[PDB]
Each structure stands twice: as structure tokens, then as C-alpha cells.
Symmetry: D3
């Protein structure tokens, strides 16, 4: 298969554009050095907010935002090409529509300097996050060692429906870049394992440790944790075998859950019952997902973190 490296990167305090640039060059130095230390490494993963940090007073301002693609994404692209590796990076992207808030964006770059995947955080961690819900869906790209790669961002990994989507579109190695799984420590480990098992795919996940807030995890396609980090600069590495995930989905019967979902009870009814019989699926597809207890909920907007509840662009 292929060797993967997940880096428990310490993002510093970011005060200006000068600091963002230091992060970028620190990320590039670490990318080249990881490759130097592990010549066999083909996939190197950096966490969410590793480029621009988490300055909640500044992160919405023009100085703290970037374009994808831009001159900084091309610096990473140049770095991946020179090192001959796949690289995963995090960039808070300026929305081309100026009446809308910026995006939380992840990108994947191949060993030739080509951006082969772009994803915008579909589920921002609210009420703390002011990012606009993504519009690129859950994309999948071709990676090393026969892997089909997809990336989600921190809070995204808590939604099992999203993990299903990546797998539904071919993904067998599910990448989760993460900024803060703080106080949500147990559940970060839990969901990484469940996202793997539910869909018969690998999960490679890493949280920012900057400087002591993160962890790093690689799970087998059966949900077994293979590698686990504890510290800033911890490099979580592991050997991935995408073909084994592909083989399980093709040759498994008893625990082929991803297949059973759309082909319920196929032994009694040839082909299986296609209608899952779930009202929430039908409501969400139509776009009227409503929980019975919504009217009595206390936090339905980001007012508690000093954000306006009017909408549009703010913090520019």
C-alpha cells in the first residue's frame, strides 16, 4: 500500500499576515523534513487552522483570508512537487461572493504540484464558527497506493451521514483534518473508529496540538485503531492498504453494512428492499429536516460568541 504521515502541528498565535506567512513556511519546512526522515511516505497531512490559526478577533478580516487557488496554495503545491508527495492543507478561503462569510477549506495536492481535491467544511462548529456552510459537496480524488481520498474538517467527522457520502462516492481512505477536539476528546476517537467501521474504509485523522491541544489517529477499515498519538510535533505514521478496504466491500457478506443499507433483507427478497423506510432521509432529501423539539431549543444562532444573527457578511 502506502505510508501516511499525520502531523500534530502546533499553530501559534496569529496576529497579522506576517504570522500567517511564518506558518506557511513552517508547514513547508515540516513537509520537506518528514519526507527526508521517511523516504517512503506518500501522504502528509496537516490539521485544520494550521495556516492561519484561531484568532477569533481577526480570522474574519481580509488580512487573515486567502484565495484557493492563490499564491500561498501554490507555495504548498511547489513544496509537494519538490518533495514528490501528496499533501493535505487547510486554508480559510475568501468567499468570491462578498455578501457571504468566508469558507473553511481543505485541499489535496499530488506529487506533481496539482490540486486534485478541494472541499469546503459543510458543517461548521457552531455557535463558535462564523464560516459559511460549504457548497462543493463531499468530493473524492485518486491518491497513492490505489487509494480513493476524501477529506472532512473536524466537526464534519461527527456527522456519520458525511462519512457515508465519501464512501458512497468511492472513498476508502477518509482524511479528517482538525483544529480543536478539545473537551471533545473521547468523541474524536470514537467517531474516527465508527466512520471507518460503518463504511469499511480507513480513517486518518489529526488534530492541531498548538502548545498542547491535539491528538492523531489511524483506524483500520474495521474500526480498529492502528496508531494513536498522545504533544506538538508528534508525527503519526502508518501503513495503509486501500485494496484491503476494497476487498472487504466486495467479498464480505455478514458485516457488509454499507451494502445492506440500500439492499435490506436480500435473502428473503432478491435485490433487497430499496426503500430504507426512514422518514428523516426523505425529509432531508426534500430539505425539511425538523426535529420535534426544535421550538424549545436555546442555541439556534451564534449570539453567545459575539456574532450578529442577521446574516450576510460580518467581521470583514
Amino acid at each position: 500500500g502506502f505510508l501516511v504521515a499525520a502531523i500534530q502541528f502546533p499553530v501559534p498565535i496569529v496576529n497579522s499576515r506576517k504570522d500567517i506567512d511564518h506558518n506557511i513556511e513552517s508547514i513547508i519546512r515540516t513537509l520537506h523534513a518528514t519526507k527526508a526522515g521517511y523516504p517512503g511516505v506518500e501522504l502528509i497531512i496537516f490539521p485544520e487552522y494550521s495556516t492561519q490559526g484561531l484568532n477569533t478577533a481577526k480570522w474574519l478580516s481580509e488580512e487573515f483570508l486567502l484565495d484557493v487557488p492563490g499564491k500561498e496554495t501554490e507555495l504548498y503545491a511547489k513544496a509537494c512537487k519538490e518533495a514528490k508527495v501528496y499533501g493535505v492543507f487547510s486554508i480559510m478561503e475568501r468567499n468570491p461572493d462578498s455578501n457571504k462569510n468566508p469558507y473553511n477549506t481543505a485541499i489535496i495536492i499530488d506529487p506533481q504540484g496539482e490540486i486534485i481535491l478541494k472541499y469546503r467544511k459543510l458543517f461548521p462548529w457552531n455557535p463558535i464558527e462564523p464560516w459559511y456552510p460549504g457548497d462543493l459537496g463531499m468530493p473524492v480524488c485518486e491518491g497513492p497506493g490505489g487509494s480513493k481520498l476524501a477529506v472532512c474538517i473536524s466537526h464534519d467527522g461527527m456527522i456519520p451521514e458525511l462519512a457515508r457520502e465519501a464512501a458512497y462516492k468511492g472513498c476508502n481512505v477518509y482524511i479528517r483534518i482538525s483544529g480543536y477536539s478539545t473537551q471533545v476528546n473521547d468523541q474524536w476517537i470514537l467517531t474516527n473508529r465508527s466512520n471507518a467501521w460503518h463504511n469499511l474504509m480507513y480513517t486518518v485523522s489529526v488534530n492541531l496540538a498548538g502548545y498542547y491541544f491535539g491528538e492523531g489517529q489511524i483506524c483500520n477499515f474495521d474500526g480498529t485503531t492502528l496508531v494513536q498519538g498522545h504533544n506538538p510535533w508528534e508525527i503519526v505514521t502508518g501503513e495503509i492498504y486501500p485494496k484491503m478496504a476494497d476487498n472487504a466491500r466486495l467479498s464480505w457478506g455478514l458485516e457488509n453494512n454499507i451494502y445492506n443499507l440500500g439492499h435490506r433483507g436480500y435473502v428473503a427478497k432478491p435485490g433487497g428492499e430499496h426503500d430504507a423506510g426512514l422518514t428523516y432521509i426523505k425529509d432531508l432529501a426534500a430539505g425539511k429536516y425538523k426535529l420535534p423539539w426544535e421550538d424549545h431549543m436555546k442555541i439556534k444562532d451564534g449570539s453567545i460568541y459575539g456574532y450578529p444573527t442577521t446574516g450576510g457578511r460580518f467581521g470583514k
Copy 2:
């Protein structure tokens, strides 16, 4: 809240109707004794296949099948009334449509002796199981201590969308009665935790132990295992449940409120959040056109490996 008890019941080898009757009387005696031992208990849970066992050569036959409701369910209901507890039972149910295979059914009986919940296994554990896919959806009923109870069956608990459905309909205590989802022992503990966390609800799960194949588990609404049984028959897994705390988490929490975020993405940047999830499989599954890219090359798409016909209809009689 309330006190729950889950029984790692030993079902024996079932060779006839006499064994089934013995199993019913065994389950009844266990119910009264569990109430006698734990006076505060309000919910007693027996695992899948506890009534009828797993005689794979006879379990599709008419002698091994029961009606819901019938004289067997009335004995369980009589017991629930006399012991003053909520009961959860398993019954392989004779399909009213004679052209179709029987159902794998779970029922909940209240302290009055009434079936307040009936559920047919939506996802049979194929290729080994010949049961017909359930047609009653995922129902939710009122339980003790302000709980909303929903029951799934063994293999059902491996599907996270089903745990979402129960919660979507109000469930704060998700019950998983389980037959023999063995060798998937790691993933049984895993999914019970994830089913709880994803939906901010309790999970109370139990498997058959008999003759040494069981496990028993109660999980908190944050996904933390509160109580855990080993692999011994007759092991009673009990614990105190606080359904209001699960409800309060759903109402008060912001950062970890994942069940809300699914249908209301980014409610800080966009007012009320984006209602469209942007997921192709959701739209495909709703229309019934759910298809995986690798379906053509799959090896197991029927139950011929275990001797069952591939043609469909009623068989095994």
C-alpha cells in the same frame, strides 16, 4: 429517571414447540425474579432469539413461528402486568402474507400488559438470515421516567442512519436486543457508543450469552459506556437512566449538538442554516436508487452460501 435491567439470557437448542414454550416460561420466571431482586426496576430487556432460538434448519417452519399478538405474547403481557414492569421481547413472527417469509419482531409491553410498541427488523443479518425486511419503520413509544423508547435488532445497530431515525422521532433511550452478532464483538461495543453519541441519547443493549456468546451494555448520551457485562449467561446488566438529561443536552447544547447541525448547517453565517445537506446518497436512498459504484463486482448478494434459494418467495417451510 428509572432503573433498567438487561438479561444476557441463555437460549438453548430448540428442537420443537415444547422447547419454545419452555423458553417462554423461562423468560417469564426470569422477569418476576429480576423484579423481586431489583424492586426499583421499571424496564426489563431480553435479547433477540430468546423465545425461539436459532435452529437454522427449522426456524422458517410453521412450528417454530408465532403470531404477534397471540397466546405467547399474552403470557408475556400477563407477566409484565403482574410484575409491574416494562418488558422487551423477541418473537419470530408468522408473516400474514403467506407468499412472504416470516419477520424478526421485537415488542415492548407496558406495566398494564399492552403492546405499546411493535417493530420488525428492518435490516436482517444477511446472508445468514432469511427473515423478510421489516415494514413497520422505526416506531417510538413512551416508557418510564419520561423516556421515549425505540428498539432495534442486532444487525440494525450497525446502521447509523437507523439510530438517527429513532432519535428523529423522539427516542432518548435506544434499545438493542441482539441474537448472536458474535465475532463482531468489538464493533458491537463501538456502534452502541456511536449510536448514543451521534444522536444525544442513551443506548441499552444486550446479546444472548447462551452457550457463551453474549455481551451487555448501557451507554450515556455522550457515548460513554456506563455499564458493561462480560460473556456469561444470566448476567444482569442494570443501571440508572436519566432521559431528561439526554433531552436537556438536545435543547441546551450548542457546540456538540450534532443531530441539529445535520439539517441546519452553518447557522451562524447563514440564518437558520443550510437545509440541504449536499449529500448524493441521501437523495438516492429517498428515491430508492441507492447504488454503490462497486456493486457489479460483489461476491455475496444472496444467501446461497447457507443453503437458501435465490429465487425469493416463501421458503424453508
Copy 3:
């Protein structure tokens, strides 16, 4: 040091005197067989209720109550002499005072067939147990391999003050014989460790497994679990105990010598330490005036919830 064996005994259903004698013969059989398989073993421990079971309808009756010493204890003593081992046994003891309820009693017998220790359960597990609180304090006796043995019974192990008392009187090997204290499974493991650590002594604990309940446990004098049994009947928990090293720790340690510190607080600043601990409950409990600020608002202060009368005196005979 010496080798110990803690037996996760299965006491069957006890319905008559005939079943008690069968238990007695089973225990004697096991003790002889344990020595046969483990030639170097010097201490063999049986759990609470192993002699008489837990028939809560009959356990206060004359048929179910024995004398200490009596013809039954002499049989245990005979076996201990024949096998040349130390034996720890459980007996529900008839109260010499017929106006008081029977005691929950444990004994230790030496390889000479003599009762060297007799303990009556100081803290009966209420409100479920009708046993009279013991009057013999917390005794300590000489044992094998340089040990000073003391025994507590199930619920007694939840009381840290009791573990301190045994240790205060010289005990370096703390035995906990446990009946049915189930559901409190995590806290059984926790307290065995903490009882050991607080006092710098070994703990050797065993619970009844019969049909599947108990988990034998051997802890080092620093609170570390050395041997842990599962939940199966007939599991024999064995380990090599070195009592001299517990003594050595008590003599040589400075930083973690907590048992000394309690009576000599801050001895560096004040030579010999402050002897007054500064705790009100200690002085209250000593004068028998220990009272919690919330005692008037408590709901369970009698055994009526299990059916026992609140009047006092002898009942259930």
C-alpha cells in the same frame, strides 16, 4: 512470602439443611483439591455466603443458621488440619442473644484446625441484609509467610476507616470475602486497590461467582492490581504475597507513608507532628454522635423496601 488461593465459588440455590451440608462438602472438597493442585499454597479463601447461600426468604430461619464454633466449623477445621493450610470461611451465625438477629460471620482457621480469627460483619449491607451489626471489632491474627491477617465482609470493604483499623492493629494482608455485591462491580475493584494503597498492605479479595457474579483480586501494598479474575465460577485467583515488603514500606518510606502522616501531620515544621487531626467527624464518631447534615431528608433508613419490619428485635425466624 506465601502463596494464596481465592476461589470464585458457586453457591447453588439453598432450599433446606440438606443443601447447606452439600455446600459444606463442596467447600471441603475444593480446599483439598486446591492444595493438591497448588502444593505450596498456604491460604485458601472462600467467599461470603458460600456455606448457606442467599435464600432471602429462609436465611433468618433456624434451619439456615449455624453456631460458631459448631459441628460445621469443626469440619472445615478438620479439613484445614488434614490439608495443612489456612482456611477462610463464611457462616451466618445464630445469635446467642435470641432477642437479636443473627450475625454475618467470617473465620480464619490455621493448619492445626483451630479458629484463630472470628469476625462479625460490622457494616451489614443495608437495607437488603437483616444481619445484626457485629460486636467483635476488627481483629487481626498471625498467618503464614510473616503475614498479619484480617478479614472484612463485602460491604465492609467500602468503608476506608475499617481498612485503616485493620492496618492500625498490625494487618499487612487484608482479606475481603464477598457475597453478592453485584452492580457495584467497578467500585469493588476500586476499593480493593484504595484499601491497599491507603494503608500500605496487600488486599486479597474474592466474590461469589455462582451463576456468574464475582471477580477475585490481589492488590500490591501500593494499590496496584497484581491478579484479576473474570466473572466465571470456579475461577481460582492465585498469587505470591510478600508481607515483609509491606512491613518494609511502612518502616522505610517517607513521602507516601500516609498511615503515619495521619497521626503526625507536618512533622518537619512541628517535630512529632500535630497529633490532633483537626477533623470533626472523627471526634463525633468516637463519641457516637456522627450525624450528617442531610439525615432528616433521607428516604431509606430501614429495610421495609425489601419487606423487613422496622420495630427491631428478632424477626424472620
Copy 4:
């Protein structure tokens, strides 16, 4: 309930008063930032020695000692008032008696800027610590979300009687601020759990991390660990605490109500229970005559191994 936050604070090297003021402002800074990061936090806890460090060569000198209250405590008071939180702070406090060594002191300040609890370490960690044994008992104050707060300091937590004392005076949230949980780390985890379980109360404990000796732990009233920090500086251990659940447990429970059982032995057979625990050490300690049998042969009974005089009085100027 209420949200708590315990900082695995790094104390740097402290060589002068200059460094002490540096730490004070660092703590104030951390207090404000934690409230900003966690909007609903009501209780913020800092470890032992966070203000003054552990410069054992200098920590007894007048430059390294403060008064309670003083201008340093006032800076903390102001910070808590501005942040609207309860703060827990460490101060090595100059002794009012000039012939006695300084006290190792913990203080709790409320959101109104008032010190509502002042505790002096009752059991200094001998022979390494030269602090005078505290003279203000084990105090309890009113806290947020209906909590009754009490604080003990590192080594104190190894004494179960001190945990008993706090609970006896109403405490339902037991705070442990610590400056040594290295190589005693396993036992630090163990005792935080046992202190909680024994007394049916929460424990919130945090050890100094700087810079790598740290720890952070929240335990539920049944002794289960809810949150666990690793060994890094600046790790903030946070969780939601429900003191009313601990209160409910103390009132509702029968079987596991060990704190009540201590004073009312076997209340079923003897109504109201036996008030005399029947423990010699309780009576000895109350009278100031607590004496271990092996005390005369103990190696360490003074602080000479760390270079402290054995004569007492005021030293280390």
C-alpha cells in the same frame, strides 16, 4: 449544574520576587482567557505552587512568602470580579506566629471578589515539605450551581479521612490542587476516584504540569473518571458538574450509601443503627493518641534527608 475548568499550569523557575509577580499576572491572564474561551465557566482552578513555585532553597525566605489577604490576593480578587468567576488559588502564606513556619494555603474567591474559603494544608508532604500543619480545619463554602466546595492540597488527597471530613460538613464538589503528581501518578488517579466514591461527591483535581509533571481529573460521585488530562502544560480539563445529583444520591440511595452506613451500622436489625463504629483508631485519633505498632522502628520521622533541622520552630530565613 455548572461548568468547571482546571488548568495544568506551568510554574517556571522562581528565583526572586520578580518571578512571583510574573506568575501572578500569568495566572490572571489565564483566568481571563479561559473565561473568554469557555463563556459559561463558573469555576476556574489553579494548582498548588502556581504563584510561588518550588524553589526549595528559597521558599522559606521572607521574599518568597505572602499574606492572606495581601496585595497579591487582591489582584486575584479583582480578576475574579472582572471575569465573574469563582477562582481557586495557591499561596505560601507567612505565619502570623513568627516562631512558626509558613502555611501552604489555598483560597477560593467568588465572582464578587471576596475570599469565601481559606484552607491551610493539614498534611504537608513530609519529609520534603517544611510547611506548618494547618489550623483552620477542613472548611466548606457556597459555590456555583448549588455546590458545596472544599479544597485539599496534593498530599491531603491521600488521606481518606480528610475526604470524609469535607463531605461530613456538606461538601459535594471536592477540589484538589496539587504540586506533585509525578511517580505518585497512579495513586493520584486512584485516590481522586476513591475520595469521590466513598463520600458520594464529585472530585475536581489538577496537578502542576510545569515543564512536564502534570495531571488533570474530574470524577463523578460514583468514583468514575469523567475527564482525564495528559502530562502537558496548559491543558485545560473541563466538564459539567451537577452537585444536585450528588445530593440526590446521598438522599435517595440505600445500598450504596456508605457515608451514612459509617455512623449507623446495621440499621435493619437494630433501628437507627449502631452509632459506635467499634474502631480503636477513631477513638485514639480523636484523643490525640494515634500510634502505629511499628512507629519506633520507622526510618523517616523528620526532614533531615532533605537538609531540614529537627528542632522545629521558624527556619529557612
Copy 5:
């Protein structure tokens, strides 16, 4: 790869040849039933003493001994050919040299009903076991899914040199059949992992549970435990083995390729590596002069503790 099954078989008390025959039929019954339940299984493994039990008073007598091959082994072979699986069995083999004690033997029979591997326990568990040290070395045969099977017996697994020898002869799936890994439970788990890691091969190991012991264990070639059974009789430990990945690791690994490094020390500084390991015990053991410096003062060097004669030859007849 292939699917393996390890049966935690319960051996009963064995008192005669009639009981041995019962055990043979039970094993055959289990083999057909396991193949029926797991249609894909290609290797079924039974533990040490499953045929004959551990009647120490009788296990050396002619009645309790069998021939390999004999009519009993051909009954096992008949089962393997009918069920179409590889089977691993335990037989206490009568020594063809009647002046020597019987062997403790393990055999592997292929799906064509033929013995393809025969092994005699090289390291009997002394002083409890009276079996003659095996003379057949450590053989390796071809198994299912491209595996190279080798078998060792319980105590054998505690010797790392033996695990090396099997791998040195091609083994990538190391089978360990076990009678008692009791009170050696922790070290059984430990060495099953280490035998795997040291040699870059799978280990599949199962112990008797008969009545409660066996801990079925499948380890990955990097030493990680993949499947783990508890202590119950009849537990079937199953998992998929991929023997070719163990082969690939041996051919492709540089850094952690320890099996190669042993005979090729520092090949970067010295091409081909230094072939002499520089170990005196390796040279001593090859020459049969392995001697520990403390052997003169050792207590147990014969079997007198378990009643065995110390002068050798045939005994127990």
C-alpha cells in the same frame, strides 16, 4: 488469506478410556458444527489435553495413552476429510520406546484426511508434567491460503528461541495449543504477542476453558492482538489470516526486520553483516553445555513436589 477457528474446548474429568472416547466424539462433533456455522473456515484448532484431560493420577498409565497414528487419529482424520478442513489435535502419545515416558503430541491433519505435521512437546511444563522431551524438532507444514503452519504446546510458547526456530524454518502462522495457561494468563497474552512480533508471523493460540480458563488469541505479524476470547467454555475465536502479508513484511521491511538482523549485525557498516551474534549462550546451547550461574542453589530441578520419582526411566505405568 483464510479463516481460522480456535475452540476454547471444555475438557471434563477423565477417569477411563470410555471418557477419552467421549472426548474424541465431542471434538469431532464440534469440528463438524464449527464448519457448518462457519462455512468459510479452513483451519479448526483444539487445545492441549482436549482428547485425554489432565487426570494426573492416571495420565501416565497405558489406558490413558494413544498411538500416533492410531484408530483415534484416523477418526479425527475421517472428520477432517468429511468436513474439508485442516484440524489441529492434542494426543498424549505412548512412547514406542517403552523404557521412556509418553510424549505430549500435536498433529495437523489436512482436508484430505492425512497427517501432514507431527510434533512432540519439546519443553514439558516441569515439575508438574512427566512427559518425555520431544525428539521431532519443530516441524513446519503447508496450510490453507499459502500459510506455513507450525505447532507448539502451551509452555513451549514461553520459550522465544522456539518461536524463532519455527520461523527460521518458514512458519508464518504459529499455532499454540494449551492445557493450562492459568495464573500464567498475563504472560500467555504477552508471549503470544511477542512470538508474533519477534518473528514477523501470525500467532493463533487457544487454551482449554474446561471449568473456566481458555483465552483464544489471534495476533498480527507486528504483534498486535486482533481477536481476544474471554474465559468461557465453548467460545469460538475466529478471524481472517493473511499469511502473504507476513511474508511480504519479511521481504520488504528494513527498519524493524529483526529476524534478519540477528544473523546480519550492522550490514550498513559491514556489508552482509557480522554473522557471529557474539552470544555465549548460543554457543553453549548448540553444544549442549547451557548452564546458568545459579543452578547449584536452585530448589526445583526434579518432579518430587508433584510426587514423581527422580531417577527417570518409565514410570506412572
Copy 6:
């Protein structure tokens, strides 16, 4: 016994000899401070590469190499003599033969500043390491508290034969100093446990933490982990070692005395056992012809992947 201290030393980025000089002074300061912190400590252990780092582009140059003995070793001897401790240090040693690559060396210095053990890395971690295979075998020296000390270096601890050799020469405390326990994390923990259990000796092992790449581990002679550090720089793993108890187990044990069994197989059946192990690899390795059957198809057999020449001699000067 004695108190050991294993420092999870942070290796800095070493660019010059000045940086090497900083490391030496850092280590000396650490050594003095650890003795001051723990007055009872007798053994202070520093990891591999602590003196010189891992500058793979410069670590073969003469500037980055030292002599044993040398002025740098005498500075450690100075420190050890002043502190009155046993010290363990790592030095990349200039090869006295100019045509050979330098050695990876470890030394033990007694309380009188004398080198009492010199060991050269027998198994350099290939392909990454260019160090020459050690020519001093596995030496054993007298240590504190009755200990026989032996030292191995990182990758050495992966070879069970080497751990056997040390014990074969009297070692009861096996020290492992390591550079990277990274991506080898689990296997480092496993082998430290197995090295202990296989040979009935203690293992004290520590890895470089600096910037976050290590752990520290003390295992009992039965393979049980007693103390475990995390991944932080400057963590000091300490514990009490009792070498006499490892000796006692070797003298007193029968059943689990595996180190004796290796040279005396089946000694009950055949007095004194069969001295011939019956293992081909032992005889091949003693003869210098260790040859695995797959060696011809192996990929990595040199250090070209890390840029090292494939013809030998002295390179990187």
C-alpha cells in the same frame, strides 16, 4: 533494593561540537538535580544519542565523534563521583581502527567515577544507522542494591536472544537506552515486558523525548509494567527495584522458570533434562551460518535508501 531514575532527555538539534558540549553539561546538571530531587536514587539513566544527537549528515564526522575513555567521559565520571550515583551514558565512539565506522556505545559509571561497564551496539538499527557492529559482546557488571547490570541500545531490545544472553551472565536488571521509540511505540512497550518475563529479570528502559518522540518504562521480573512515562521531554521515570526478588524467583520457581527450562527440557521424565534444545537455528548461528529461507528475495540489505555506500569501510568522514 534501590531507587532508579530514567530521564526522558530531550535531544537538541546538534550542529557543532559546542552543541555536544552543551548536551554534556545539560546531562551533568540533570544528574546533580535528580540526586538533589531524589536523595535515595542510586541509578540515573540517560538515553541513546543524548550526548551527540541524530544529525545524520554530520554524525559520522570526526567533530561529532568521541573516545571512550576521553575528557568527555571523565566529566560524566566527575559528576557521578560527586553525586555518588551510578550513571548510564551514550557516546558515539570513534573506532580505534581508522578503516572502520564508529561504534554506538553505552557506559555505566559507578559512584567512584570508574567505568565499570562498556558496551558497543551489537545490533545497529539498519538500514538507517551506519554504526559498526559491536565487538564487546553483552557485558554484565555489579550495580547498586545487589543488582547485576547490563545495558542494551534501542534496537538491541527487539532481539530476545540478546536479553537471554545478559541474564545468562547474571543480569537481574536489564537497561535499554534508546533514540527513537517512535512508530515503534507499541513494540517498544511489548519487548521491554517480554525481555523481563522471558529471563526473570527487571527491565529499565528509556527513550529520548526530544521534540516529542519517547517514553520510559520499568518492568517487574514477571513482565509486568510497574511505571510508565508519557511522550514529554524531561519526564523522570522512577521506581524501587528489588534485584534480590528476581534472584529468588530464579532460585525458587519451578513451573514458570523458563530460563532454566531452555537447557533442561523435560527434566521430570529425563533427570537433568535433554541438554540439546533440538533447534537448527541455534546450531547454525553458533557456527556463523544463520540463513533464512527467503533471504535471496529480500529488498533492503544495505543503507543506500538513506544514502550510505554499499561496499563498507569508513564513510561519512
